[PDB]
Amino acid sequence: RSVCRQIKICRRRGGCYYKCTNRPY
Numbered sequence: 001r002s003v004c005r006q007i008k009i010c011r012r013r014g015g016c017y018y019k020c021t022n023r024p025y
Contacts (some may be wrong), residue, residue: 004022 009019
């Protein structure tokens with residue numbers, strides 16, 4: 001599994017969703 005946090009990732013084409021981004025924390 002991972003140890004990231006979910007963000008409302010958005011695109012220019014396609015749309016937005018829940019992405020585990022993983023910020024260096």
